[PDB]
Design a protein around this ligand. Structure first.
Ligand SMILES: C[C@@H]1O[C@@H](O[C@H]2[C@H](O[C@H]3[C@H](O)[C@@H](O)[C@H](O)O[C@@H]3CO)O[C@H](CO)[C@H](O)[C@@H]2O)[C@@H](O)[C@H](O)[C@@H]1O
Length: 138
């Protein structure tokens, strides 16, 4: 796949589905993001924004964008990615949350703030190369 990536999720999200992303973090990475989007047009709500950042004390930010407004960020001050390194990034869609798994290691559970049933698109962009995106268990 080429970046930016912004594609419909086949059949939408359902509990039990996984999004499996294989990529390589840029040697000079500052950030990248994965968005679960309600729609495809500019201004669309983002049910789940997953945002690793290497600026400062390395961390991953998690949030939701609704009606043009970012909600209260969640943050985990641990960085499972590495500049220049390949990664395997998995989002397991469960009833209560998105379960994030990185390189086989469970990393975070982000509670749903918008209904998973209303997510239509996946958007990926930033300082990485994308090798593949697969939807499993749809
Ligand atoms: C640093 C910021 O990066 C972009 O905006 C992102 C937004 O930044 C938050 C920041 O994470 C938070 O700690 C602070 O309290 O408010 C900032 C402004 O909203 O965070 C959201 C997720 O919460 C997205 O990642 C945004 O891209 C940029 O647009 C800002 O100008 C600023 O440089």
């Amino acid at each position: 796949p080429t970046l930016p990536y912004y594609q419909p999720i086949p059949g939408g999200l359902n509990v039990g589905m996984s999004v499996y992303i294989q990529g390589v973090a840029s040697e000079h990475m500052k950030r990248f993001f994965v968005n679960f989007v309600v729609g495809q047009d500019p201004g669309s709500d983002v049910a789940f924004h997953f945002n690793p950042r290497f600026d400062g004390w390395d961390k991953v930010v998690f949030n939701t964008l609704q009606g043009g407004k970012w909600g209260s960020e969640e943050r985990k001050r641990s960085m499972p990615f590495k500049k220049g390194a390949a990664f395997e990034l998995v989002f397991i869609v469960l009833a209560e949350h998105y379960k994030v798994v990185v390189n086989g290691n469970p990393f975070y559970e982000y509670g749903h703030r918008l209904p998973l049933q209303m997510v239509t698109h996946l958007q990926v962009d930033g300082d990485l190369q994308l090798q593949s995106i697969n939807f499993i268990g749809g």
